[PDB]
Amino acid sequence: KAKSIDQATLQLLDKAKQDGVETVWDRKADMKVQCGFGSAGVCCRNCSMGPCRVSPVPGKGVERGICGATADVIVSRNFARMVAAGTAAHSDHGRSIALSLYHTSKDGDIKVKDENKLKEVAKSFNVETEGRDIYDIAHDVAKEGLSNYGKQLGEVTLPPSLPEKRKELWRKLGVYPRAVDREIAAVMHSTHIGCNADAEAMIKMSMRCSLTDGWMGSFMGTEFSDIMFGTPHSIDTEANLGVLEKNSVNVVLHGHEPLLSEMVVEAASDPELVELAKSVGADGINLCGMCCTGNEVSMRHGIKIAGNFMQQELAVVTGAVDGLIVDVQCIMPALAKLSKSYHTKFITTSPKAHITDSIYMEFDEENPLDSAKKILKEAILNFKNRDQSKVMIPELKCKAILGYSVEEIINKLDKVVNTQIGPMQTVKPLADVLVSGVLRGAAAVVGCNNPKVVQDSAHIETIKGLIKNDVIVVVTGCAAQAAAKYGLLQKEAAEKYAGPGLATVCKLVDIPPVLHMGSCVDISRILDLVGRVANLLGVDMSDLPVAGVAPEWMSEKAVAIGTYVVTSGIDTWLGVAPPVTGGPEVVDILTNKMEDWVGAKFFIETDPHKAVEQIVNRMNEKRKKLGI
């Protein structure tokens, strides 16, 4: 089968074959037929009595592990641990952001750039703002956010966009969230040998844990990032590997933590570093981003996006990356080995993400700007080691428009508001187009790449099908970057791919049919948007014609995201089967019984066209339930 639908990706794969280096596709081929027990989730290693593998087919073979655990128990515990790991990644990101907020000052490297957003957040956290210094408010807000992570007494703080009905449903179900780290610890405790051996209770614990990601960790990370670095607005950028410059220093920012990439962007305008780039024979400094850190700097500053997850290696294969600076998460360790075949300096910066044989330059949060400057200086000085005979940058780049935060979307919707009617600054125009049926619904396309799927194929096919069916699409993460590379993040795309209702809406509001809402933590924005719509219509989020899709997901973070999206009341389609087919009870809970609990459920569909059809049918069913 084809490795990708992206032509630049294919050219660089040919180059990597010529250079004798191996990619993620080569390692996937080397893995051959993957273990059936692990693929079905019926393998357990939770204690040293094991490893235990039970039959994925009930009634045949070994039925129980040594402790007596059934296939359903093993599957449910494995699924819960995936959710806990994803929640941990997102919560650690949000915790770093909250600590950065706590360390803001007027004359420091980290300031408050959006005071209005900070005051609204302070209102949401019961922090007084009138007649107060802005940094005192910021510190109080950071304290409340940090308490959300580890409070042992009392209730956590949740955003006002979350409907009261959803909160009450969670409380009745027993999944109402506690402090984030406490829920992660609870999930890890209940999967220990000889604890929870009941699939339904295990799934409910995992949902409870995922809620602390969706509504607390990711939400606080996003809102505090907006406070410190600015709320995203409509902004132009370029996407795909063609953004690399042969005649300039190329600095590629990979990872998820935004403070480092923000400081690197600021350092790139330093006169001394620009002069140094000129002195090593380069035209200038060309910052490019990848994955979620690329999404953040692109949403807030228009930094060009070099590529998504499965392109990271190919970025090095060009031979033009002088410095690859990585913080945490979704950083293929093979990059270190790959960097030996080129001049590239592979720089790790976080104590959480040491990588063997990489150059470690710890990013100092006490002096973020100076630390970013020294890291960037190492990248710039590496330009002298460039071998221009090994350089091949495909001439394939695509224009994209992004920056669609909830605030930006509301500002855009204000155009189609009659002044004599109003109100202004609400999601009411979006609610109106959804209720009238001009738009059939809204769908979030999120997730990673996965060698099991032709890279970016499922993302593009799902998005095109949805917008052709007058479903407005919001995108995050690597799916958003696939849309950017393909050319869907363009106003012209409305008349090229969208159906009649969505084309009319795009023309009236002057937006692309596909709205890039940011990184994987920025999925919280999607929740926020949906919540607002629900609160405007006086219904729960499970009554709306909305859906989420993860066509090509790979990470534990994706599992946690899908779990909290379903738990919030939004049906989720998974384009890659999770390792649960071995447990019939777990499959039945996730795809059938979940609808009785939270009004939504998982859909597993590896065919994107069938997924689009199912999404449209489900949205029409919910519309008929709602009367619209």
Add this chain to the structure above:
Amino acid sequence: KAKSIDQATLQLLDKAKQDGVETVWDRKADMKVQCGFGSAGVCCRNCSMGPCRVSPVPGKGVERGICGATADVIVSRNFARMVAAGTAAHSDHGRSIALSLYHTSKDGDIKVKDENKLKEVAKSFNVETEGRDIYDIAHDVAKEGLSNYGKQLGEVTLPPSLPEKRKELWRKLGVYPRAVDREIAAVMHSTHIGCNADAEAMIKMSMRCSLTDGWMGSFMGTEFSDIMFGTPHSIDTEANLGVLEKNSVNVVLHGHEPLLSEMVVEAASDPELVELAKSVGADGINLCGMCCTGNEVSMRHGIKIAGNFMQQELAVVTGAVDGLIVDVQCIMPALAKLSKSYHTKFITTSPKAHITDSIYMEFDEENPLDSAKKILKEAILNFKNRDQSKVMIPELKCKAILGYSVEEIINKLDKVVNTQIGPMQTVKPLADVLVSGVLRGAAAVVGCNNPKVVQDSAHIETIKGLIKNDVIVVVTGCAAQAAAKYGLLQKEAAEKYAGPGLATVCKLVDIPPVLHMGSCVDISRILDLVGRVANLLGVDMSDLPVAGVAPEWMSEKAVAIGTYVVTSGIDTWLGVAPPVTGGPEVVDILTNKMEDWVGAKFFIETDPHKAVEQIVNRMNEKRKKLGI
């Protein structure tokens, strides 16, 4: 191979074969040859690009996972997740204890029974005590303990017995602990795909996480349990399955959390329940404990111990267990199936541990005594369903002495203190016998059973070898219960098994050669003891001739325990190989490089006699280093 060295265990295995019921041994046999990849730790399932298996033999076969992770990376992440799971189990136990402390009242079900212990703990937590109400002090202490779990700013609180040198070494190494749930979340975050791919850093993160178990979670759980339920003192009890009564109601308490078992013990003396037991035709109520909850109620009240981990099923096989009340952890789910073959009521009580097809009676912490009375009444009423023709109780039980908390040990040591010299109430006599060489050292024997080892064989052989070599032995958990069943927890055992120096010490102090220090969380007591000795000698804990042994461990909790014991500076022998042989770098870190970091290291030895020899040699070389 023999299944056990215990004769009562063998008789009940014959009965289980005659009854056509499966045991843990039968399921272990059914599992046959366990997966080599999982056994070596070279299998990874951390993302849905996998499952990935790399060769346990370097230089052959597949070398890297799909993301590029090496065998060392996969092994180190798997080990770190085991540590995180064990830390989560212990920390959740301690968190429940702290919450119970927070709800103590003068006229409530949960009171303060050891005010002196509470005042000393309050001193350790910087809580004022002079001229204050005892329950105000208790609530402040509980608040400080709870803050240890989830504080995001500042430093955690550690017991005064921990040497300053050990803390400084931890700070220099980068493993100084943070809040417990924060460290669990950090480990889970760094094992996520594309985060940490460096074995040394991964092992250091796991050590940092395990410290929050050893010195914060388990320590606080133990000390708060002492405050609420009484400090253990020397007390007599009986051990092994013979403690069951044919003519009495048999109520078996299995699990770890002590509040439920304490309330059940209190409810058993209720006049209405005793009258009900008489009216259902029984002579009375016979409470028996298993595993750690049995250890707690036995340490504090002399409740008879029915058996350790791999005996739990056999307790039901007798046909005499009218009620089996379980809370969390090390509860084989197969019990639910097994109790169908008998009249036994298998009662789950904790929302953390639901077991399918068991009778769920949620233990209400708000009204603990009434809830315990209701559960106990269900067990008593089940006596009418006893089938006395199916009853077979082995006439095999053994006298044991336990209750050796640090306070009790100090009280015993006061006997050999010359009044004209002093001081009293210190560990000084123990330090003196260790320094003089009358005792060669002290060894902690802890851990579970494991079907991979003849049950209780390794525990007994290791303990007998150590005490024969004049090494005083402290025991916890299932190892302590194996010693109890065998008969080592007896004063007579001193003249039957101990060497000359240990026999003299036992005669002078009037103690058994093997000291039962309580449950698995009570391993913190061992730490406390060692710390005191170190603080009395002005040395670090790694300079002492001390060791820990886990001859037959199975649980993730055991992994976390061994990790924090080694990190504290105490060499640890493992009688069951952990899944790390696939990663040569991880093996080298755990067994060789750890000594450079923390002055102690792991020893993997499956032969108990060889383990005793190695322990004696290591203790002698540490003595020669210390000059004693």
